[PDB]
């Protein structure tokens, strides 16, 4: 269908920019960068012989732009180059080059509120058993699309009903490491499918030890007696998570990575979720069991509000897109 | 390169030449209804097949103009699709017809054909409305690919048991559903670079034999032929190896196999659509028996290649 790039959010702390996309611009509202070319979404295609597809031999990051400012761009590209190195990928561009191109890509979409995926793959120039690393030709692929909300505005305000998956667990670090962001979502998709079977909105997975892990596209945070905790092991080192723990410490709470049991999840004062794709939101029940009184808690509410302020308040967290 | 002189009496390419006028000669893909050359075989980065690897596939081969075990391959593909709740947008008959025609267009008498079914680009992962899903089929046919060279089919291969990674459990990403999610397989390949071995074998979370990147392992001991039952793709080559083993009068079974049984084996071998059957003559530098290929493996290897040329229901002729 047609492109939807702004909304009236029911929420005083989230406001889209007031502007119009130019219909003569074939990149307006969405675009990719593929092998040196800025192209429209319908032409955003990669080789089926790229190992990024047939062996998912790839890592990526996803950042966002809000009111014409990219949020924590440095952290994101640094995390991306760290993940590349963890899987022995040498990026074909420097971090600076990648920032320059991603920011120009956003600019060409004219999008003031955007999500930008930067992906690095092993390439199509070699195959998986290639010993000679000089034969590997890694690729960079980028997309900039309208901002996407994992949970709608009304659930950011009223909260989401969480489900702990029983039919599947998060892939162990000794197989496919969740700390390296990747497209290998077999377990995460099974979890989604289980939410369909059980009638819930979002799943959280446990790890091999039955400790909280993460969900598809989000980290979970658990608050108890003024201590703010988030899973340290089987979870992506989220940049939203990092922000949430910084805000928590600002509010005077102990904020740490930790192992969290399911009993501690059920017994929490407050539970929330976070991600670049939607910000921060409350989880007000788990498996149909209320967290406290089943409405978003006050700590969660101040975290959410503060996260959105950090998206507009001038600071080193914000990098202006040159439209 | 689409032919070789193999130096092996039981492996022989066809004698022919590709027509250079034909832009699909020697390799091609089938993408969204179109037969295209390799260079134009691209898919949408908004296909969930890419960004969530929401996809399954199979790879069958063609030898001397015949597809080998095509029925088994497409049955496995459709079972794997059903396992991840994928409704293929084509029937098994249709996939076979398109795939055989793809091969015909490449003129390849020896080839590997990948058939992939993805969740598509018309929806995103959280879409609850399954009628919105629009799965895509992508196919490719390229020259036959050898996981191990001809001289090592003859002489045998030096195996390594991966210690820095294990095979993904069935409770996360099921190895019995053929998939592109090779993060662990790639790590194992990298560990073989580090430790100086040719191929890796992975263990499962219980430390029992799993499989390797692109191959099943088979362990032979006191006349009994065994292959890992759990953390392993149900290979079509594996199936053939066990049928061959039975025909030779050996007990042939899937089982749980320990590392001690691997080192203590009479014979070990590997198998794959991408290269047939080959010997593993050492593990972690320790000889399997006398460190040369064993007679059971050699018999199985030869019979496998025989099954690739003797007329039977195992072979489907491509109409070039
Ligand atoms: C599996 C998973 N966990 C967590 C996150 C959130 O991380 P970040 O806050 O850096 O977006 C994502 C984002 O896509 C994800 O895919
Ligand atoms: C992980 C894995 N195991 C086993 C096999 C062997 O399966 P088959 O004999 O059906 O080709 C493959 C083939 O690609 C594979 O990728």
XYZ file of C-alpha atoms and ligand atoms in Angstrom:
675
model
C 0.000 0.000 0.000
C 0.927 3.708 0.389
C 3.567 5.008 2.826
C 2.640 6.153 6.387
C 5.429 8.303 7.910
C 3.792 10.342 10.721
C 1.101 9.798 13.397
C -0.730 11.701 16.085
C 0.580 9.737 19.052
C -1.743 9.897 22.030
C 1.336 10.940 24.031
C 2.713 14.383 24.919
C 6.346 13.164 24.957
C 6.298 11.607 21.421
C 5.815 14.047 18.533
C 6.502 13.482 14.846
C 7.842 16.261 12.631
C 5.378 18.413 10.656
C 6.383 18.062 7.011
C 5.597 16.534 3.630
C 7.497 14.130 1.436
C 8.198 15.350 -2.087
C 6.499 12.892 -4.540
C 8.927 13.741 -7.410
C 11.801 12.253 -5.376
C 11.877 8.520 -6.111
C 13.721 7.910 -2.817
C 11.278 10.001 -0.671
C 9.955 8.003 2.320
C 12.256 4.999 1.864
C 15.483 3.862 0.239
C 18.489 1.518 0.306
C 22.224 1.756 -0.346
C 23.549 -1.300 -2.174
C 27.012 -1.568 -3.766
C 27.544 2.158 -4.134
C 24.024 2.996 -5.341
C 21.211 4.805 -3.541
C 18.086 2.995 -4.792
C 14.325 2.810 -4.076
C 12.801 0.033 -1.924
C 11.454 -1.869 -4.932
C 15.029 -2.083 -6.315
C 16.641 -2.958 -2.942
C 17.928 -6.429 -3.869
C 20.940 -8.568 -3.012
C 22.518 -11.580 -4.668
C 21.194 -14.994 -3.613
C 24.905 -15.943 -3.750
C 25.750 -13.516 -0.969
C 26.687 -15.673 2.035
C 24.736 -13.148 4.112
C 21.687 -15.020 2.763
C 22.589 -18.668 2.261
C 24.656 -18.999 5.460
C 23.281 -15.838 7.221
C 26.971 -14.992 7.477
C 26.182 -11.435 8.499
C 25.752 -9.018 11.359
C 23.913 -5.733 11.500
C 22.685 -2.845 13.612
C 19.544 -0.734 13.501
C 19.555 2.880 14.569
C 16.836 5.486 14.479
C 16.426 9.143 13.532
C 13.922 11.268 15.478
C 12.982 14.877 14.599
C 15.860 14.943 12.096
C 18.466 13.645 14.581
C 20.111 10.225 14.593
C 20.091 8.758 18.120
C 23.396 7.405 19.492
C 24.943 6.876 16.039
C 28.454 6.383 17.437
C 27.388 3.618 19.845
C 25.542 1.817 17.056
C 28.331 1.787 14.508
C 30.836 0.919 17.221
C 28.654 -2.029 18.238
C 28.302 -2.990 14.598
C 32.117 -3.011 14.045
C 32.565 -4.909 17.304
C 30.049 -7.600 16.118
C 31.788 -7.783 12.703
C 35.125 -8.413 14.417
C 33.528 -11.114 16.709
C 32.698 -13.079 13.514
C 36.045 -12.210 11.838
C 34.486 -9.873 9.231
C 36.688 -6.995 8.073
C 34.303 -4.174 7.092
C 34.985 -2.763 3.601
C 34.259 0.770 4.916
C 35.563 2.676 7.953
C 33.112 3.669 10.743
C 33.231 7.287 9.451
C 32.414 6.259 5.903
C 29.466 4.165 7.152
C 28.086 7.083 9.214
C 28.476 9.453 6.263
C 26.601 7.145 3.882
C 23.847 6.175 6.324
C 23.203 9.852 7.118
C 23.088 10.737 3.400
C 20.684 7.810 2.859
C 18.307 9.170 5.537
C 18.639 12.683 3.978
C 17.607 11.369 0.548
C 14.471 9.715 2.013
C 13.570 13.085 3.500
C 12.465 11.070 6.576
C 12.641 13.012 9.867
C 11.505 9.978 11.840
C 13.299 6.861 10.538
C 14.839 3.496 11.153
C 18.145 2.775 9.505
C 19.559 -0.732 9.182
C 23.267 -1.151 8.438
C 24.260 -4.703 7.527
C 27.640 -6.252 6.878
C 27.871 -9.635 5.079
C 30.741 -12.005 4.082
C 29.794 -11.399 0.452
C 29.168 -13.223 -2.810
C 32.793 -13.403 -3.967
C 33.730 -16.508 -1.934
C 31.986 -19.511 -0.341
C 31.984 -20.746 3.248
C 35.042 -23.065 3.122
C 37.334 -20.455 1.492
C 40.588 -20.468 3.524
C 42.119 -17.492 1.721
C 40.716 -14.406 3.502
C 41.931 -12.105 0.685
C 39.271 -13.785 -1.508
C 36.436 -12.712 0.838
C 34.679 -9.559 -0.405
C 32.448 -8.294 2.422
C 29.445 -6.140 1.502
C 27.589 -3.342 3.196
C 23.817 -2.963 2.701
C 21.753 -0.172 4.252
C 18.059 0.700 4.382
C 16.221 3.764 5.736
C 12.445 3.247 6.238
C 9.763 4.973 8.329
C 10.018 4.513 12.121
C 8.358 1.232 13.239
C 6.585 0.630 16.555
C 6.763 -2.864 18.028
C 3.855 -1.940 20.307
C 1.202 0.713 19.494
C 0.980 4.044 21.355
C -1.934 2.899 23.541
C 0.089 -0.085 24.819
C 3.083 2.160 25.575
C 0.648 3.966 27.885
C -1.438 1.009 29.191
C 1.148 -1.819 28.994
C 1.593 -5.131 27.182
C 0.746 -8.704 28.226
C 3.964 -10.807 28.191
C 4.355 -14.578 27.594
C 7.307 -16.777 28.670
C 7.839 -19.239 25.792
C 7.755 -22.937 26.762
C 8.333 -24.582 23.351
C 11.653 -22.906 22.566
C 14.713 -21.304 24.197
C 17.102 -18.595 23.101
C 20.047 -19.881 21.143
C 23.059 -20.426 23.409
C 26.185 -18.304 23.162
C 28.075 -21.554 22.424
C 26.192 -21.890 19.094
C 24.899 -18.575 17.703
C 25.686 -15.726 20.073
C 22.775 -13.344 20.769
C 25.348 -10.729 21.764
C 26.298 -10.433 18.109
C 23.239 -9.016 16.391
C 22.134 -11.403 13.676
C 19.343 -12.497 11.334
C 19.247 -16.035 12.713
C 15.793 -15.823 14.251
C 14.684 -19.485 14.163
C 14.069 -19.551 17.913
C 12.542 -16.022 17.975
C 10.093 -16.949 15.234
C 9.102 -20.164 17.014
C 8.412 -17.925 20.049
C 6.269 -15.562 18.014
C 4.362 -18.567 16.697
C 3.777 -19.760 20.249
C 2.272 -16.342 21.132
C -0.200 -17.006 18.292
C -1.024 -20.428 19.736
C -1.439 -19.109 23.339
C -3.082 -15.709 22.594
C -0.399 -13.282 23.836
C 1.091 -10.118 22.324
C 4.870 -10.697 22.764
C 7.115 -13.583 23.904
C 10.151 -13.570 26.166
C 12.537 -16.519 25.826
C 14.556 -18.188 28.573
C 18.123 -19.516 28.059
C 19.523 -23.100 28.652
C 19.674 -22.406 32.393
C 16.021 -21.211 32.458
C 17.145 -17.637 33.114
C 15.510 -14.693 31.348
C 16.973 -14.018 27.916
C 15.228 -11.614 25.532
C 12.412 -11.334 23.049
C 12.244 -10.896 19.306
C 13.451 -7.346 18.753
C 13.561 -6.268 22.428
C 15.344 -6.509 25.788
C 13.428 -7.023 29.021
C 14.081 -5.050 32.207
C 12.882 -6.143 35.668
C 12.501 -3.697 38.592
C 12.362 -4.877 42.225
C 12.676 -2.818 45.431
C 14.478 0.000 43.634
C 16.952 -2.288 41.880
C 16.768 -2.191 38.080
C 18.023 -5.352 36.335
C 18.300 -6.705 32.788
C 19.572 -10.051 31.464
C 23.336 -9.981 31.005
C 23.948 -13.198 29.028
C 21.508 -14.396 26.327
C 20.539 -10.892 25.243
C 21.767 -8.381 22.696
C 23.640 -5.470 24.330
C 20.846 -3.106 23.361
C 21.559 0.598 22.913
C 17.982 1.261 24.222
C 18.788 -1.016 27.140
C 21.983 0.932 27.787
C 20.003 4.190 27.782
C 17.412 2.719 30.152
C 20.067 1.710 32.683
C 21.672 5.169 32.449
C 18.233 6.789 33.155
C 17.652 4.331 36.033
C 20.965 5.332 37.633
C 19.938 8.982 37.150
C 16.757 8.296 39.074
C 18.951 6.974 41.903
C 18.420 3.236 41.359
C 21.009 0.506 41.209
C 20.977 -0.506 37.511
C 22.859 -3.636 36.443
C 23.109 -6.596 34.138
C 22.259 -9.794 35.971
C 20.851 -13.291 35.744
C 17.094 -13.183 36.406
C 14.955 -16.198 37.348
C 11.381 -16.683 36.245
C 10.218 -16.463 39.883
C 11.864 -13.040 40.078
C 10.075 -12.062 36.866
C 6.645 -12.968 38.312
C 7.523 -11.281 41.617
C 8.789 -7.988 40.125
C 7.398 -4.564 41.094
C 7.681 -3.498 37.448
C 8.647 -5.057 34.125
C 9.417 -3.192 30.906
C 10.734 -3.794 27.382
C 12.937 -1.688 25.175
C 14.233 -1.558 21.599
C 15.217 0.899 18.888
C 12.005 -0.273 17.150
C 9.521 1.345 19.554
C 11.439 2.862 22.493
C 10.330 1.678 25.925
C 7.022 0.188 27.109
C 5.597 -1.562 30.186
C 4.807 -5.261 30.512
C 1.905 -5.374 32.973
C 1.409 -9.140 33.180
C 3.337 -12.344 32.471
C 1.457 -15.489 31.403
C -1.780 -13.782 32.475
C -0.414 -13.021 35.967
C -0.458 -9.366 36.945
C 2.798 -7.611 37.663
C 1.912 -5.831 40.916
C -1.504 -4.299 40.283
C -1.348 -4.854 36.515
C -0.885 -1.249 35.444
C 2.381 0.430 34.393
C 4.497 1.349 37.395
C 5.835 4.852 38.202
C 9.494 4.002 37.639
C 8.607 2.614 34.154
C 6.622 5.777 33.333
C 9.511 8.101 34.261
C 11.906 5.904 32.244
C 9.704 6.079 29.160
C 9.209 9.849 29.427
C 12.900 10.432 30.005
C 13.874 8.269 27.021
C 11.774 10.395 24.689
C 13.217 13.656 26.129
C 16.695 12.348 25.365
C 15.511 11.979 21.753
C 14.855 15.788 21.411
C 17.079 17.515 24.022
C 20.299 18.828 22.451
C 23.287 16.703 23.520
C 26.118 14.485 22.232
C 23.502 11.715 21.807
C 22.056 13.491 18.764
C 23.553 13.903 15.304
C 21.644 16.208 12.925
C 20.751 14.849 9.484
C 21.574 17.335 6.678
C 18.381 17.336 4.628
C 34.457 -24.776 -14.709
C 31.666 -27.335 -15.214
C 33.679 -30.544 -15.904
C 36.803 -32.247 -14.560
C 38.907 -35.311 -15.219
C 38.476 -36.939 -11.820
C 41.212 -39.620 -11.658
C 38.531 -41.980 -10.277
C 37.008 -44.733 -12.467
C 33.587 -44.451 -10.734
C 33.183 -40.634 -11.179
C 32.809 -39.422 -14.774
C 31.417 -36.116 -16.032
C 29.495 -35.941 -19.268
C 31.323 -35.097 -22.482
C 29.727 -31.971 -23.919
C 30.057 -28.214 -24.349
C 27.871 -25.340 -23.211
C 26.337 -23.157 -25.937
C 27.904 -19.679 -25.392
C 24.917 -17.933 -27.114
C 22.626 -19.113 -24.313
C 22.883 -16.556 -21.488
C 21.799 -19.201 -18.934
C 24.326 -21.824 -20.097
C 26.381 -23.061 -17.174
C 24.256 -21.459 -14.435
C 20.934 -19.770 -13.662
C 18.245 -18.919 -11.134
C 14.447 -18.960 -10.966
C 13.168 -15.891 -9.135
C 9.553 -14.710 -9.024
C 8.551 -16.550 -12.208
C 11.628 -15.506 -14.176
C 14.564 -17.584 -15.362
C 17.606 -15.314 -14.999
C 21.398 -15.476 -15.240
C 23.497 -15.650 -12.030
C 24.381 -11.966 -12.147
C 20.692 -10.939 -11.971
C 19.731 -13.540 -9.332
C 18.993 -11.074 -6.547
C 16.290 -11.049 -3.874
C 14.613 -8.248 -1.893
C 16.394 -7.292 1.331
C 12.841 -6.979 2.719
C 12.306 -10.674 2.222
C 12.170 -12.186 5.725
C 14.203 -14.973 4.145
C 17.084 -12.514 4.482
C 16.531 -10.379 7.635
C 15.040 -13.091 9.913
C 16.396 -16.082 7.868
C 12.721 -17.207 7.876
C 13.345 -19.911 5.345
C 14.105 -23.507 4.599
C 15.512 -25.291 1.569
C 16.950 -28.313 -0.041
C 19.722 -29.036 -2.489
C 19.488 -31.889 -4.955
C 21.958 -32.790 -7.653
C 22.038 -33.905 -11.268
C 24.598 -36.448 -12.583
C 24.924 -37.511 -16.281
C 21.662 -35.668 -16.958
C 19.639 -37.302 -14.167
C 18.341 -35.702 -10.973
C 19.141 -37.960 -7.983
C 16.326 -38.665 -5.492
C 14.265 -35.620 -6.538
C 11.094 -36.973 -4.948
C 12.813 -37.433 -1.574
C 14.324 -33.958 -1.777
C 11.044 -32.156 -2.523
C 9.176 -34.240 0.061
C 11.810 -33.203 2.636
C 11.548 -29.545 1.629
C 7.761 -29.535 2.075
C 7.984 -31.310 5.419
C 10.587 -28.731 6.587
C 8.346 -25.914 5.361
C 5.408 -27.367 7.306
C 7.678 -27.664 10.376
C 8.107 -23.865 10.393
C 4.447 -23.284 9.403
C 5.315 -22.228 5.860
C 2.663 -22.863 3.251
C 4.499 -23.227 -0.057
C 2.916 -21.180 -2.864
C 3.537 -24.056 -5.306
C 2.797 -27.805 -5.136
C 5.517 -30.494 -5.105
C 4.753 -31.276 -8.803
C 5.153 -27.602 -9.753
C 8.500 -27.224 -7.929
C 9.819 -30.376 -9.639
C 8.713 -29.129 -13.071
C 10.225 -25.652 -12.643
C 13.419 -27.082 -11.130
C 13.971 -29.616 -13.934
C 13.292 -26.907 -16.514
C 15.789 -24.605 -14.727
C 18.436 -27.337 -15.063
C 17.550 -27.838 -18.746
C 18.031 -24.117 -19.429
C 21.585 -24.204 -17.939
C 22.502 -27.186 -20.145
C 24.327 -28.614 -17.094
C 24.515 -32.430 -17.151
C 26.289 -32.316 -13.764
C 24.765 -29.788 -11.350
C 23.494 -28.711 -7.981
C 20.028 -27.272 -7.645
C 18.987 -25.303 -4.576
C 15.262 -24.827 -3.939
C 14.447 -22.319 -1.224
C 11.070 -21.365 0.281
C 10.924 -18.133 2.344
C 8.310 -16.209 4.317
C 8.441 -13.449 1.644
C 8.637 -9.648 1.609
C 4.872 -8.915 1.783
C 4.736 -9.102 5.595
C 6.945 -8.612 8.671
C 7.668 -11.063 11.506
C 4.873 -10.002 13.918
C 2.080 -10.298 11.333
C -0.690 -12.302 13.064
C -2.795 -12.487 9.883
C -1.388 -15.499 8.000
C -3.309 -14.701 4.782
C -1.038 -11.628 4.552
C 2.033 -13.880 4.337
C 3.327 -14.263 0.793
C 6.009 -16.970 0.691
C 8.515 -16.954 -2.198
C 10.268 -19.781 -3.926
C 13.796 -19.181 -5.224
C 15.812 -21.704 -7.201
C 19.358 -21.926 -8.449
C 21.214 -24.414 -10.615
C 25.018 -24.201 -10.756
C 27.935 -26.578 -11.511
C 28.315 -29.566 -9.152
C 30.338 -28.599 -6.067
C 32.865 -30.775 -4.277
C 33.167 -30.300 -0.538
C 36.359 -32.415 -0.681
C 38.627 -32.779 -3.745
C 38.930 -35.976 -5.801
C 42.294 -37.023 -4.331
C 40.792 -36.937 -0.812
C 37.719 -38.922 -1.765
C 40.433 -41.460 -2.638
C 42.891 -40.833 0.207
C 40.543 -39.627 2.992
C 40.109 -36.457 5.038
C 41.473 -35.226 8.416
C 38.535 -34.453 10.755
C 38.443 -32.118 13.776
C 36.025 -32.190 16.699
C 34.967 -28.584 17.360
C 35.606 -27.427 20.940
C 34.738 -23.668 20.710
C 31.162 -24.142 19.559
C 28.357 -26.715 19.584
C 25.521 -27.444 17.191
C 22.322 -25.508 17.824
C 19.893 -27.565 19.938
C 16.575 -28.667 18.481
C 14.970 -26.470 21.184
C 16.347 -23.309 19.527
C 16.966 -23.807 15.794
C 16.266 -27.367 14.728
C 19.041 -28.987 12.612
C 16.457 -31.422 11.311
C 14.908 -28.506 9.401
C 17.384 -27.528 6.713
C 18.235 -23.908 7.208
C 20.562 -21.021 6.457
C 21.339 -20.386 10.098
C 24.999 -21.381 10.020
C 26.456 -19.179 12.817
C 27.677 -22.293 14.666
C 28.797 -24.083 11.468
C 30.810 -21.018 10.459
C 32.463 -20.787 13.883
C 33.457 -24.456 13.489
C 34.928 -23.732 10.072
C 36.930 -20.881 11.605
C 38.197 -23.161 14.394
C 39.551 -25.577 11.695
C 41.519 -22.624 10.260
C 42.897 -21.929 13.746
C 43.862 -25.509 14.511
C 44.894 -26.495 10.947
C 42.365 -29.211 9.994
C 40.356 -29.832 6.829
C 36.698 -30.151 8.095
C 35.004 -29.867 11.514
C 32.437 -32.114 13.214
C 30.254 -30.570 15.926
C 28.938 -32.146 19.108
C 25.466 -31.445 20.627
C 24.796 -30.108 24.122
C 25.097 -33.646 25.536
C 28.529 -34.025 23.804
C 27.247 -36.568 21.355
C 28.094 -36.410 17.682
C 26.015 -33.951 15.695
C 27.011 -33.140 12.105
C 29.351 -30.878 10.163
C 28.866 -27.867 7.834
C 27.199 -29.375 4.818
C 27.648 -33.033 5.878
C 26.500 -35.977 8.013
C 29.024 -38.249 9.769
C 28.844 -42.038 9.719
C 30.726 -44.311 12.138
C 31.415 -48.005 11.462
C 32.349 -50.434 14.204
C 32.384 -54.270 14.278
C 30.249 -54.389 11.142
C 27.552 -52.008 12.408
C 26.953 -48.755 10.569
C 25.831 -45.761 12.623
C 24.930 -42.086 12.050
C 23.786 -39.451 14.614
C 20.003 -39.464 14.996
C 19.426 -36.138 16.788
C 21.473 -32.996 16.048
C 21.763 -33.804 12.340
C 19.937 -33.077 9.142
C 18.101 -36.161 7.813
C 20.383 -36.191 4.768
C 19.283 -37.809 1.520
C 22.898 -38.950 1.055
C 22.797 -40.294 4.574
C 19.610 -42.196 3.783
C 21.323 -43.621 0.693
C 24.461 -44.589 2.692
C 22.380 -46.552 5.218
C 20.359 -48.277 2.461
C 23.701 -49.144 0.780
C 25.070 -50.423 4.095
C 21.965 -52.660 4.495
C 22.257 -54.028 0.948
C 25.834 -55.030 1.828
C 24.433 -56.967 4.797
C 25.398 -54.500 7.572
C 23.101 -53.380 10.357
C 22.456 -49.682 9.582
C 20.959 -47.433 12.247
C 20.620 -43.904 13.573
C 22.008 -43.619 17.061
C 23.595 -41.504 19.736
C 27.377 -41.687 19.271
C 29.994 -40.611 21.792
C 33.398 -39.033 21.067
C 35.092 -42.144 22.487
C 33.236 -44.273 19.892
C 34.389 -41.908 17.132
C 38.134 -42.254 18.025
C 37.617 -45.974 18.532
C 35.831 -46.581 15.220
C 36.980 -49.058 12.568
C 35.921 -46.597 9.858
C 34.480 -43.067 9.662
C 33.076 -41.297 6.602
C 31.171 -38.136 5.642
C 28.368 -37.622 3.191
C 26.605 -34.797 1.439
C 24.728 -33.906 -1.765
C 27.628 -31.509 -2.264
C 30.342 -34.139 -2.943
C 28.936 -37.620 -2.343
C 30.758 -39.847 0.120
C 34.314 -39.583 1.385
C 36.514 -41.112 4.119
C 37.588 -39.533 7.403
C 40.918 -41.209 8.224
C 41.748 -39.259 11.370
C 40.062 -37.191 14.082
C 42.008 -34.494 15.934
C 45.169 -36.048 14.422
C 44.459 -39.515 15.816
C 44.278 -42.277 13.216
C 41.021 -44.102 12.644
C 42.421 -47.688 12.551
C 45.434 -47.623 10.191
C 44.674 -44.100 8.935
C 43.753 -45.069 5.390
C 40.329 -45.544 3.932
C 38.617 -48.707 5.079
C 37.072 -51.317 2.803
C 33.487 -50.728 3.989
C 33.762 -46.981 3.195
C 35.336 -47.755 -0.214
C 32.470 -50.149 -1.060
C 29.865 -47.573 0.024
C 31.531 -44.770 -1.963
C 31.618 -46.898 -5.157
C 28.085 -48.157 -4.772
C 26.849 -44.554 -4.231
C 28.282 -43.512 -7.581
C 26.893 -46.630 -9.199
C 23.450 -45.665 -7.923
C 23.978 -42.307 -9.724
C 24.209 -43.945 -13.211
C 22.321 -47.311 -13.110
C 18.758 -46.754 -14.352
C 16.226 -46.932 -11.482
C 13.499 -44.998 -9.681
C 16.350 -43.030 -8.007
C 16.987 -41.133 -11.243
C 14.878 -38.564 -13.097
C 15.997 -37.651 -16.627
C 16.219 -33.923 -17.434
C 14.753 -33.058 -20.872
C 17.535 -30.863 -22.250
C 16.965 -9.752 19.445
C 17.020 -8.287 19.815
N 17.215 -7.864 21.100
C 17.272 -6.565 21.449
C 17.162 -5.524 20.506
C 17.215 -4.081 20.950
O 18.517 -3.521 20.830
P 18.687 -1.967 20.540
O 18.104 -1.279 21.807
O 20.170 -1.741 20.386
O 17.877 -1.749 19.307
C 16.962 -5.847 19.071
C 16.781 -4.766 18.062
O 16.474 -5.057 16.920
C 16.881 -7.292 18.718
O 16.694 -7.732 17.442
C 24.039 -29.028 7.900
C 23.945 -30.100 6.846
N 23.954 -31.418 7.184
C 23.865 -32.403 6.283
C 23.802 -32.167 4.906
C 23.714 -33.326 3.956
O 22.374 -33.416 3.486
P 22.066 -34.104 2.058
O 22.780 -35.453 2.070
O 20.566 -34.228 2.046
O 22.662 -33.136 1.042
C 23.805 -30.780 4.394
C 23.774 -30.499 2.931
O 23.915 -29.350 2.546
C 23.880 -29.702 5.416
O 23.912 -28.383 5.083
